[PDB]
Amino acid sequence: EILEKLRSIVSVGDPKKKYTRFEKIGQGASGTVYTAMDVATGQEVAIKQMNLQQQPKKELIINEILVMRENKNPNIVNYLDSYLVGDELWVVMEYLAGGSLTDVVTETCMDEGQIAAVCRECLQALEFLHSNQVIHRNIKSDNILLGMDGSVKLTDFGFCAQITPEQSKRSEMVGTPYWMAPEVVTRKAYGPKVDIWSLGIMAIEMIEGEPPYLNENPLRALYLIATNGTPELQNPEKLSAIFRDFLNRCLEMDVEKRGSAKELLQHQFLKIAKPLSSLTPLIAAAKEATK
Ligand SMILES: N[C@H]1CC[C@@H](CNc2nccc(Nc3ncc(C4CC4)s3)n2)C[C@@H]1c1cccc(Cl)c1
C-alpha cells in the first residue's frame, strides 16, 4: 500500500473548482487528456486523468510525478500539480498550443533543416535527462509537442527509469514496440542510449511518415527488430550523406558505438538546422489536414 506515498505527494483541493472549461483533446493507454483553464489565473492547462485501476503497479505513477517535478527544463512539458480524484489521478501540466509531432509527420513532408531542428531540441531534452540519471524509454513523435512559436517539448514520464552509479542499467521490457531498441527487445541490460535509438526511429518517422514495420502487428515488429537490427530506409538515396551519417550513429547496434546525446548534439547534421520558426508552417499544415 504505497498508495499512502502517492496520497502524500499530491495536492489536496478540488481540481474541479480550480480549473474550468474542460475539453477532451486526447485519449491514450495511460489515460484521457483534457484542456482547461485555471479559474483564478486564466492559464491554459492540460490535465491527464489516469484511472488507478488501469495501472497495476502504482509505483510507476509515483515515479512519474517525482521525475517530472524534479526535472524541469525548457524542452520538457512543465509539470504544474497533481490531485487524486477518487480512484483517478489528475496530473496538470502547461498547455502547449500547437500540435503533436505525429500530426506533422503523418500529414506533411519535412525538409532536412526542419528535421535537424526537431532532433536538436529533443537531443537537448535527452542530454538534460540522461545527465540527471533518467531514461525516458518511450521516445516517439507522439510524445513530442510543438509550440505555436515552434517550441519543441518532450512529454510522458509514465515509463521512465531512474538509474544510479550502483544500478546503471535496467532490464524491464518497456516502451512502444516499433520504437524500442534491440537491447530492450532482447532483454539485455540497457542504459540511456535506448533513448537515442528511439530518437533515430523518430527521425525515420519524420522522413517516411512511420517507424519501420508499422504495417505489421506489434509482436511481429518485435521479432523484426530482434532479427534485423539497424532498420533500412525505403529510399536512402533521398537523404544527404550527413543525415544518413546521423541516422547511422543513432541506430548503431553496438551500444558503446551508438552516440550519446552529448556527442550527437555536436553532429554536423544539426548545423543545417533551420530556426524553430520554420516549424510553424508544418503546424498550420497539420491543423488544416486534420480539420
Ligand atoms: N497522445 C498525445 C497526443 C498529443 C497531445 C494531446 N493533443 C494536443 N493537441 C494539441 C495541443 C496539445 N498540447 C499539449 N500541451 C501539453 C500537453 C500535455 C501532455 C498533456 S498536450 N496537445 C498529448 C497526448 C499524450 C501525451 C502524453 C500522454 C498521453 Cl496519455 C497522451
From Swiss-Prot:
Keyword Cell membrane attributed: yes
Primary location group: cytoplasm
PTM sites of type Phosphothreonine: E172
Phosphotyrosine carried by residues: Y34
Role this protein plays: Protein kinase involved in intracellular signaling pathways downstream of integrins and receptor-type kinases that plays an important role in cytoskeleton dynamics, in cell adhesion, migration, proliferation, apoptosis, mitosis, and in vesicle-mediated transport processes. Can directly phosphorylate BAD and protects cells against apoptosis. Activated by interaction with CDC42 and RAC1. Functions as a GTPase effector that links the Rho-related GTPases CDC42 and RAC1 to the JNK MAP kinase pathway. Phosphorylates and activates MAP2K1, and thereby mediates activation of downstream MAP kinases.
Subunit text: Homodimer; homodimerization results in autoinhibition. Active as monomer. Interacts with GIT1. Component of cytoplasmic complexes, which also contains PXN, ARHGEF7 and GIT1. Interacts with NISCH. Interacts with DVL1; mediates the formation of a DVL1, MUSK and PAK1 ternary complex involved in AChR clustering. Binds to the caspase-cleaved p110 isoform of CDC2L1 and CDC2L2, p110C, but not the full-length proteins. Interacts with ARHGEF7. Interacts tightly with GTP-bound but not GDP-bound CDC42/P21 and RAC1. Interacts with SCRIB. Interacts with PDPK1. Interacts (via kinase domain) with RAF1.
Name this polypeptide is given: Serine/threonine-protein kinase PAK 1
Gene: PAK1
